[PDB]
Design a binder for this molecule. Structure first.
Ligand code: PLC
Ligand code: PLC
Ligand code: TTC
Ligand code: ATP
Ligand code: ATP
Ligand code: CLR
Ligand code: CLR
Ligand code: CLR
Ligand code: CLR
Lengths: 572, 572
């Protein structure tokens, strides 16, 4: 079996440094081990500390498995259940179990066998009635909290872990289901699996199931040893219970007071035989799956989440179509007359801005998953690179490409723009590039930010500032010499400039050309080239492709920054 | 005392109609009355049904207080605690208690006395350590769940209610605090207060506190009567417990199975003496505070929430200032030259759009409170009109007015616009009006909508469509005769038109005027009046003020629509 141990553990949290956990020692031999205590004692903190999930800065003690230190593949053989559930709502139960099993369990086993285990676990936890039901979403009524909790438990139970940690496995579950869950854990722990869990308000039948007990309170350790001997240990010191029915309530009624009480009990413990014995024993003793597989399964999960979140995919497509048709009707039949310039520039500007501002929604779905991503990374699911590229090939690439195609296909021929294929495809390509660059910038800004409202604000502000330098609201030749340099950071500038260059080039907007020919007018701006020059634009085709290479470089740089912001993030 | 009763209750929920509650009967005499049952049984549903919070369409039975029907002032003397807490996070505990006491309790009592009661309740619930701490927020670490729950309880406990309903008063609380809470309830119920509550996993000491028991399961009623006699009732029929320690666990172990089991037990009950007796008894028996006070306290709460939510007030002000300065630097020194027209129109358009699009954030804070508003309305806090006007005088009026002032004060003199006071104040007034109209439209759209992402999408789309008709992106004289009518629904059109009219009117943009004077150029658009005409604008001052009256009418109409959308909302 696995004989976990610890000695002289202490912990600190930061400015001022608070000591959540003080001197703690104990041994957790195979079987069933529990951690009772009141709220705020330090239950969850200790549990994470034992499962290598707290920053090692505060930790100041030795955690040893079987005497030898922590194995490097430790996280590949231990499961951890979270106090607050982390389960993708837009998926079903079975999808999530398949995902966890697929990424964590080895791929030598056939898919039929993994599905077999999944069915077995569903039976064990009593989830047949909601096996295929969707977990909670803001649009669909969610499954009951108990079923969600059992799902979180199963996602880790399927891994066949030799060591298992649970933080409040039974919170909100009715008594019968909780009894079923714990009987299952006992049946499993009688095979060598070393289980460690916290719990609130057990019943006596449960309390007889224990094999080792730990009692945390205000950081300090009150008692550690066999479950049976705890009552007698207290009996000797005092509190002749003889009246309470459930020993757990009795144990807490002493912590809660029913010189300082905490210190008194803790010193009684350190003067107990149990602590001497455990100090004696302590002193005496002292990735699974390749890159491609991770990428594929992450991308599939994101496919499903995106299709199930119908405010960034379907709403976006529909509004794009409606806008395209409306624009087509409004600007219909563009004329080479006085009004031609205004309409043409306006439509191009609108398309550019809409592409730029349509990326906020997609990244926002990337922000919310932060916590989920951290939990899944620590647990040992996927690398960082895999998660990044997966979310890219699932969200950024597919959905952002379509709007440009639809917009151009509808608009170009209704309005009456340049009647050449080259211009058509150039317009489509340019819109794609601005869209991707905006999404990249949003990812860079919003990567590793917990809150969405702040990120949305920042991105919106940045886009506004970029828009002021587009080329239509202000003429860029009037910009002061000490601020024109800012115009090179503007995505809309490159997109709009490139769209204007390929449209106005072969155009003349003064209808009377013989009349215009004899005496041209100084302040007339008849032709497209003159307007182009006045806005400060080159005429050479290099003057067009320069914007595209700039956009590509921006894409590369911003994606790299996002990857690093994720990499040096605090995953603890 | 208060002798509640019910008879033949049934309930339905809708398309297909599901019957959540079947035949139910019982009496809840003064004292302590509990409602045990498993998840999904119908606990919360029954509790709401008894407290007049379910739509009366499904209800099909008689709820009688002391034989006489439900008094009209019933909600003025009964408190109701919610299963999921509804407590304003941005406030402290004491602020919330003051708010509830101020609006619900009468104003004859002095404020010192109300504060006295608040302190007493804080002592009763054990919240001295977190009395002034802020409740959970997305920026500040939140207080523990137990303290939040106790706060929700106190907000209703302070009312001195003759009848009190609780849905899971003790969920997540540690045993000691829960014991304290229930001992408090018992001490209070021994004075005539009739308490009715649900609960999960009581302990035996608690179970002895009961005076009446109700056992719901899958809608059906399993047992109703004195707490003591329940065990013997089962004993007679079966299940010779004699082994379980806590009777509550025993009672549920029979519902959960530890021809159909549910129907069998229910029929055993209807064949019991208890049901005969209660059927016999049933057959035998068968605003506080004015408008101004509500308005003031609602407005104060919104002051505090807005100042505590630093993403719609402080961020907005700061970004406004930064944008104003940047604009001032960019367009600095506008010249009456060829470029004058483009820069002038662009700056005006930008200000208009920014005012229009800056209203999404404020309304979004109005959306999230929907659920809270419904709960507070039903409980009997405030009228609808009060809540509306309060949120208006707190959020819409103050914050939306400032941006225009700041924008104009900074911009007008840096750029070099019309050097006349009249134009300055006209510009300020116009910006105010567009801002208010946009906020009104957002309120109309977002009133009575549960989700924020959908509302944000809708408002953004509407503003975009309005913007396409502003007057700059497209010339409105080229619009087809069968779509120009849509331009009269555009707020930015009125604002932008009014800003342009008072600026370009006294301007000439062709620098060589003697050169221009001898031979004017057809396609020249030198003066401001010509450009104004070409965009399709009247020159008479009525041609300016018409936009303002239109904006005012839009404001009035949209606010009225919002009020009605709230009024005919389903408050049940
Ligand atoms: C003048 C108008 C035209 C020019 C507009 C320029 C926009 C540039 C946008 C890209 C910047 C970027 O990508 O920011 C990248 C930075 C990089 O973060 P980090 O340093 O690696 O943090 C490391 C974190 N650790 C320690 C955990 C690793 O992300 C941020 O700081 C997030 C906030 C950025 C706000 C930027 C607002 C800029 C407003 C400019 C107003 C004049
Ligand atoms: C060219 C410039 C275009 C400008 C368009 C501006 C439209 C503004 C209308 C506001 C009406 C309003 O807000 O009314 C309020 C309505 C609902 O009202 P209700 O049914 O009474 O709900 C009360 C029901 N109760 C009483 C039972 C509770 O909200 C909405 O419908 C929100 C959807 C509006 C979508 C607008 C999309 C426009 C697309 C146009 C494509 C050509
Ligand atoms: C989508 C229309 C447009 O992109 C455009 O092409 O013209 C200009 C402009 C636009 C959108 C927005 N703004 C603008 O000035 C300001 C703005 C704020 C928005 C906010 C508030 N931000 C200031 C954080 C949102 O929450 C959601 C969408 C938002 N969209 C916009
Ligand atoms: N990262 C942290 N930053 C600040 N305070 C913390 C941090 N982690 C814990 N604490 C503080 O330590 C105290 C106890 O936290 P802890 O995680 O141990 O809860 P707990 O004892 O396990 O009870 P429960 O399971 O119900 O959450 C709390 O007051 C908490 O504020
Ligand atoms: N408005 C509703 N729409 C759809 N289903 C509903 C609605 N109200 C109740 N139900 C369903 O009726 C069943 C019983 O719901 P109920 O509210 O009574 O549970 P409960 O008594 O509150 O238990 P608990 O408080 O622990 O969650 C549930 O399956 C629930 O989904
Ligand atoms: C119908 C037209 C005229 C409306 C204009 C387009 C916008 C306002 C409409 C078009 C289709 C709509 C979507 C249609 C379907 C869904 C799925 C539903 O579970 C939530 C709302 C949501 C996401 C709608 C949001 C609003 C929406 C995007
Ligand atoms: C951290 C982020 C914002 C870095 C910003 C880097 C951007 C602005 C850099 C990356 C590559 C650069 C471009 C490289 C080459 C060209 C072609 C030249 O004939 C004009 C300048 C131009 C177009 C540069 C403009 C600035 C540019 C686009
Ligand atoms: C481009 C310029 C104008 C950006 C303006 C950003 C300023 C105005 C915004 C951006 C993010 C905002 C911060 C977001 C979160 C917090 C944490 C909170 O505990 C105090 C307020 C504080 C610190 C906000 C203050 C306002 C803030 C700093
Ligand atoms: C439910 C919502 C969309 C109501 C829409 C009502 C708006 C569009 C109505 C309300 C008041 C109306 C305005 C009242 C007076 C004038 C002045 C006149 O010289 C031109 C028309 C104009 C400007 C009207 C246009 C239409 C108008 C603005």
């Amino acid at each position: 079996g696995a004989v976990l141990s610890f000695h002289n553990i202490c912990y600190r949290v930061k400015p001022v440094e608070k000591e959540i956990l003080s001197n703690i020692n104990g041994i957790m031999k195979p079987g069933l081990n529990a951690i009772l205590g009141p709220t705020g004692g330090g239950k969850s903190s200790l549990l994470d500390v034992l499962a290598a999930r707290k920053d090692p800065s505060g930790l100041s003690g030795d955690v040893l498995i079987n005497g030898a230190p922590r194995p490097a593949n430790f996280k590949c053989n231990s499961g951890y259940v979270v106090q607050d559930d982390v389960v993708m709502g837009t998926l079903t139960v079975r999808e999530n179990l398949q995902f966890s099993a697929a990424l964590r369990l080895a791929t030598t086993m056939t898919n039929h066998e993994k599905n077999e285990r999944i069915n077995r676990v569903i039976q064990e936890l009593g989830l047949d009635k909601v096996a295929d039901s969707k977990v909670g979403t803001q649009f669909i009524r969610g499954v009951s909290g108990g079923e969600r909790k059992r799902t979180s438990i199963g996602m880790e139970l399927i891994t066949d872990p030799s060591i298992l940690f649970l933080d409040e496995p039974t919170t909100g579950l009715d008594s019968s289901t909780a009894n079923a869950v714990l009987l299952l854990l006992k049946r499993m722990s009688k095979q060598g699996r070393t289980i460690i869990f916290s719990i609130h308000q057990p019943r006596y039948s449960i309390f007889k199931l224990f094999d080792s007990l730990t009692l945390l309170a205000s950081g300090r350790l009150m008692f550690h040893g066999p479950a049976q001997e705890a009552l007698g240990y207290f009996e000797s010191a005092g509190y002749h219970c003889e009246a309470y029915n459930n020993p757990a309530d009795f144990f807490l009624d002493i912590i809660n007071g029913d010189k300082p009480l905490i210190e008194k009990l803790a010193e009684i413990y350190v003067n107990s035989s149990f602590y001497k014995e455990t100090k004696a024993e302590l002193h005496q003793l002292s990735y699974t799956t390749s890159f491609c597989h991770q990428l594929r399964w992450v991308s599939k999960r994101s496919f499903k989440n995106l299709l199930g979140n119908p405010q960034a995919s379907i709403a976006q497509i529909i509004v794009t179509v409606v806008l395209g048709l409306v624009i087509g009707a409004i600007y219909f039949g563009l004329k080479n007359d006085s009004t031609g310039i205004q309409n043409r520039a306006g439509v191009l500007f609108f398309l550019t801005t809409n592409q730029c501002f349509s990326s906020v929604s997609a990244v926002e779905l990337f922000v919310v998953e932060k916590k989920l991503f951290i939990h899944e990374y620590i647990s040992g699911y996927y690398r960082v690179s895999s998660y990044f590229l997966g979310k890219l090939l699932s969200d950024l690439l597919p959905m952002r490409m379509l709007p440009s195609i639809i917009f151009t296909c509808i608009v170009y021929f209704m309005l009456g723009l340049k009647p050449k294929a080259d211009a058509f495809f150039v317009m489509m390509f340019t819109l794609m590039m601005v869209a991707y660059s905006a999404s990249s910038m949003a990812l860079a800004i919003a990567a590793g930010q917990s809150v969405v409202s702040v990120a949305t604000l920042l991105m919106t502000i940045c886009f506004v500032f970029m828009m002021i330098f587009s080329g239509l609201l202000v003429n860029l030749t009037t910009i002061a010499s000490w601020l024109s340099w800012l115009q090179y950071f503007s995505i809309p500038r490159y997109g709009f400039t490139a769209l204007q260059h390929n449209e106005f080039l072969g155009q003349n907007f003064c209808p009377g050309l013989n009349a215009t020919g004899n005496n041209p007018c100084n302040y007339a701006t008849c032709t497209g080239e003159e307007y182009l020059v006045k806005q400060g634009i080159d005429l050479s085709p290099w003057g067009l492709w320069k914007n595209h290479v700039a956009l590509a470089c921006m894409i590369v740089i911003f994606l790299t920054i996002a990857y690093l912001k994720l990499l040096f993030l605090k995953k603890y």
